[PDB]
């Protein structure tokens, strides 16, 4: 399908890697490509970050870049976009008035939650009459066994399930952010971890894309390939459909 895509950022060998792994698409967490010059059938979208990202130019450029429309990163997050609904929500109208297709903003976690900032959220664009396209969410496993994959699918199935809107998955891979330090999976833990979720993400109906976080390991410790070299991990993510 037209599932599979990446996170990625500017370094030696970024187009050939794209096309390597067979990426349908890709984001950089910006409004342009950042300098990533993208293979053919590998479609950019752009992404607003933050509060300071909301500008005519920036929104003007996101539109020349694509058609899809990425809005605030982890704004439940002190260390992200740090913002509150109700900042989120008036700034929504500018996002809105591009005409793109229109992602929520992609909570870090809590998205079923009753109460919780995805919940208000969609609640009062509900309540002002706003358009909300899809839901982009972040998931990090913890528990590193066969076990995962089916975890992934009840955080999905529940977002769904609460909301009804289309689920885009921009960052997903196995990490403990629990402990005081971040804890990784052996590497044959991972490569199993892409190959089973990757299967799942296919099957399910209402998920229209996924992102592993991510591309190379100059970005994270679980990156698919180093320059154009992909790991076991990367094999599985090119072998997926
Ligand atoms: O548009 C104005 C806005 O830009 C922000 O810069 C962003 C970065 O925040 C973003 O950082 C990514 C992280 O959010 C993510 O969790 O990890 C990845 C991988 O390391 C990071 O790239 O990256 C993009 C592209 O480089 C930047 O545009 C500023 O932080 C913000 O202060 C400013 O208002
Ligand atoms: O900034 C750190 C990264 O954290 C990710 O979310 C984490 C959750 O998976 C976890 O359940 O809770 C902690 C909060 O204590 C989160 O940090 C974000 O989704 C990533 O984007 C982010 O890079
Ligand atoms: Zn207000």
């Not at 058609?67 to 992200?80: E, I, M, R, V, Y």
């Amino acid at each position: 399908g037209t599932k599979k895509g990446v996170s990625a950022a500017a370094f030696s060998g970024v187009t050939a890697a794209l096309g390597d792994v067979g990426a349908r698409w890709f984001y950089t967490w910006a409004a342009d490509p950042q300098g990533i010059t993208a293979p053919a059938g590998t479609e950019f979208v752009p992404m607003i970050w933050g509060r300071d990202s909301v500008t005519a130019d920036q929104l003007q450029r996101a539109k020349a870049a694509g058609s899809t429309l990425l809005a605030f990163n982890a704004p439940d997050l002190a260390g992200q976009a740090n913002m509150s609904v109700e900042t989120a929500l008036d700034l929504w109208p500018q996002l809105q008035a591009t005409g793109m297709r229109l992602g929520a903003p992609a909570v870090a976690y809590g998205g079923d939650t009753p109460g919780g900032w995805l919940d208000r959220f969609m609640s009062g664009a509900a309540a002002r009459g706003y358009r909300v396209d899809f839901i982009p969410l972040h998931w990090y496993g913890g528990d590193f066994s066969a076990a995962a994959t089916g975890q992934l699918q009840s955080y999905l199935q529940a977002v769904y399930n609460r909301y009804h809107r289309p689920i885009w998955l921009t960052e997903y891979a196995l990490t403990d952010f629990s402990g005081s330090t971040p804890r990784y999976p052996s590497a044959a833990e991972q490569a199993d971890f892409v190959s089973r979720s990757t299967a799942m993400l296919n099957g399910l109906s209402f998920v229209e894309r996924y992102a592993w976080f991510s591309l190379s390991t100059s970005t994270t410790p679980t990156g698919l390939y180093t320059g154009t070299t992909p790991n076991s991990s990367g094999v599985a993510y090119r072998a997926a459909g």
